[PDB]
RNA sequence: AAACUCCAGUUGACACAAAAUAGACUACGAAAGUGGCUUUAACAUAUCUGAACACACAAUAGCUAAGACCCAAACUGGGAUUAGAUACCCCACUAUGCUUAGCCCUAAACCUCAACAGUUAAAUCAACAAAACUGCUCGCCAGAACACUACGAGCCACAGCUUAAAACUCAAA
């Protein structure tokens with residue numbers, strides 16, 4: 004899917020966060036899923052730069068308070 | 076083409092080493108070489124005893140003469156280095172900087188079973 | 194049979210690796226014991 | 239053979255190559271290059287001398303010219319190394335391929351075939 | 367201190383000493399372990415022979431020379447003769463894969479000498495001469 | 504011609520000559536020198552050497568594959584979770 | 589660009605005019621090529 | 637016909653190939669320090685690729701450079717140069733005890 | 734073997750039959766000998782698992798094809 | 808046992824020989840082949856197929872001539888072993904393996920798979936080997952043995968190689 008690139012980038016930068024996957028919940032929304040949703044929202048706003056939209060989405064989520072520890 | 080002469084010279088006093096280097100570069104120029112650069116890797120003990128011109132050496136000075144020369148000259152230069160006495164050893168190679176680094180992307184894996192029949 | 198032979202070889206290799214490394218035991222590492230044979234039925238070394 | 243002072247094929251077209259120092263000219267001449275550069279210069283000379291479109295290489299005439307240059311190289315090599323069976327085979331096979339190409343050119347374009355035979359000094363002899 | 371199996375490098379000053387002597391000065395016990403014989407010779411750091419022994423010199427003859435006990439006896443005799451000249455510590459340089467390859471060392475230990483280093487100098491030809499054909503037995 | 508008492512040299516630790524000899528023998532075996540000498544005692548004809556090398560390579564490949572298979576399958580070597588069925 | 593770089597480098601080439609000076613400079617010089625590699629792939633430079 | 641259908645593209649999660657430690661670096665015969673890292677300290681034997689973990693191209697380059705240095709008086713043949721006994725250990729071999 | 738109990742219980746509850754044990758050779762092709770000639774073979778066989786424990790196809794599939802018994806299968 | 812006892816060990820000097828480890832790599836070449844280093848030259852063909860004989864190659868062994876000769880080594884001599892000779896074993900040593908220039912042109916020269924192009928769908932398919940085939944071309948085979956023979960022809964080959972029968976005989980091979 005198109006969101007696969009965003010997911011790969013997010014998992015490269017941050018990896019598996021402290022919030023584990025509750026695959027038993029069909030309505031579960033992972034941290035990577037939240038990042039993808041915010042990226043899609045910002046893309047709908049008209050922005051096109053992937054490597055800049057990534058940072059903007061990260062900033063928005065940090066403002067929201069989501070933990071975004073980097074891998075290194 | 077671009078050649079690199081690795082030259083191990085007899086451990087001598089500085090004026091003698093200067094004279095030997097000047098003589099060798101003069102021979103290279105006579106054979107037609109344009110000497111790009113001259114380097115010195117210092118004087119060090121040889122990795123093994125080397126006998127040359129009825130004399131055994133345990134230490135020597137290392138130099139690298141980068142140059143350009145017509146191909147037909149190289150053989151001649153080798154002969155000259157064979158006849159010199161202050162030269163413990165001398166080898167002319169194609170210059171490594173002329174060998175471009177064709178970048179390897181990685182190690183592609185291969186299944187091990189086929190290796191029995193292949 | 195061949196599977197048991199490979200298992201014996203693997204046990205021999207594992208025991209040799211344990212002997213060689215110093216992390217298992219300073220005494221065992223200092224002994225430098227070498228194994229002639231390893232055979233599984235219990236295991237005989 | 240081309241004069242040793244002849245520039246390499248790539249370096250004869252760059253602008254300002256006539257103003258560089260004599261050392262730079264030597265470093266880009268045939269003197270400081272292997273035999274393959276001389277072969278390339280020879281091939282370019284033959285192309286500009288014989289074929290109507292030297293820019294084209296897939297043409298039969300260009301292939302014949304290149305193979306003739308290779309045949310000359312193999313002959314010069316064997317003149318020194320008489321005991322080289324591999325290059326003897328390569329020379330003979332290249333001569334056979336050139337004969338086949340000349341036969342095809344003669345069957346297709348006879349005027350240009352005559353031009354090839356004159357320029358490269360090749361005499362086309364029918365097989366026994 | 368941390369023991370390193372690597373020998374001390376000649377020309378570099380190491381703290382290791384034996385009887386107030388450096389590793390470069392310790393006498394050298396050359397051992398040759400052939401299949402039919404074993405020879406032992408102690409020499410000084412200046413290549414001065416001090417003691418020599420072999421299975422044949424110790425009275426063993428023919429096949430009896432190939433036994434490890436013969437090499438042990440040769441080591442005992444060589445160690446005694448060297449110790450008579452003041453040899454205490456030795457550097458063992460063993461070549462060949464004879465039965466006595468180790469036994470000779472034991473003999474030196476039984477002779478009273480102290481081995482501080484074991485060196486293998488087995489002549490391994492980097493594709494040199496052609497060995498004899500395999501025995502048809 | 505090389506400097507001596509560097510190659511194939513092991514320092515005896517606290518007079519433990521036997522351990523030092525064992526270490527030296529293990530080093531030579533790891534480097535294959537002992538097998539090299541044993542094979543060089545008599546001439547091995549090139550066809551025989553090629554056959555032996557090919558057989559050794561095939562044996563090593565087969566042994567590695569079998570070890571991998573055994574390690575993979577031994578993960579199921581546990582107590583029966585559905586006894587009585 | 590290659591030709592221009594070569595022409596610039598020609599200035600530093602050794603000739604019969606500066607032969608002795610270049611020889612003396614090289615004799616005073618000490619070029620090192622030794623450098624190790626880590627398990628991670630880092631070029632460990634020579635200590636001195 | 638529908639947006640939810642999968643699209644065709646290269647695996648985005650594909651992790652990069654584990655390049656050999658010397659990949660992208662120029663192996664030279666004069667670099668005795670680098671070459672000695674792949675030889676046996678006690679015998680000077682060149683380690684196989686299963687010990688060095690090097691790719692085929694780099695293994696061949698290292699072997700050729702080692703042979704050239706040995707024959708050209710840059711590197712001891714029967715032993716590793718003692719001056720490099722303390723260099724970083726990159727080969728996967730354990731000898732002592 | 735994980736679902737053997739559940740499948741047997743479901744079959745018993747629904748009034749139908751279950752066979753989750755080691756399928757003996759000829760339980761279908763040789764049913765007349767193993768049960769008496771008057772035995773009535775199943776009119777439909779439902780495989781919840783079409784592979785045996787060695788990952789080969791269950792022999793019951795081939796046997797039911799031989800005896801012309803339709804097979805529903807997961 | 809014979810042999811050697813200017814024999815052996817250490818150190819030093821010291822090759823026209825052979826090319827550990829790398830190589831657990833599977834590369835180059837048409838095949839044979841080719842695994843020390845450097846340098847030079849160099850790895851045919853922008854459609855395929857195309858020869859017992861034309862053209863050019865062709866492991867080992869062998870021949871001719873001149874060198875080299877560490878080691879190995881048919882043959883030979885000696886010592887053992889054997890009832891005994893020979894062989895297996897030990898020792899010494901030669902042709903020979905090496906170089907130069909010619910010749911000989913053989914192999915289980917075998918991936919025992921002709922070259923080129925295409926396919927993985929049917930029936931997958933005698934068996935085994937190595938999954939089954941299709942298109943196209945060249946070469947080859949038509950029971951066994953006689954026969955890698957005889958004769959003829961060709962060859963620097965002269966106890967040779969290539970091509971290669973028939974008669975008698977069998978009901979199998």
Ligand code: FES
Nearest residue numbers: 179181656659691
């Ligand atoms: S892994 Fe790429 S050069 Fe070795």
Ligand SMILES: [K+]
Nearest residue numbers: 556828830842
């Ligand atoms: K090898």
Ligand SMILES: [Mg+2]
Nearest residue numbers: 855856857922
């Ligand atoms: Mg053809």
Ligand SMILES: [Mg+2]
Nearest residue numbers: 865866911912
């Ligand atoms: Mg031949």
Ligand SMILES: [Mg+2]
Nearest residue numbers: 876901902903
């Ligand atoms: Mg001879």
Ligand SMILES: [Mg+2]
Nearest residue numbers: 839866916917
């Ligand atoms: Mg073959």
Ligand SMILES: [Mg+2]
Nearest residue numbers: 921922945946
């Ligand atoms: Mg054909």
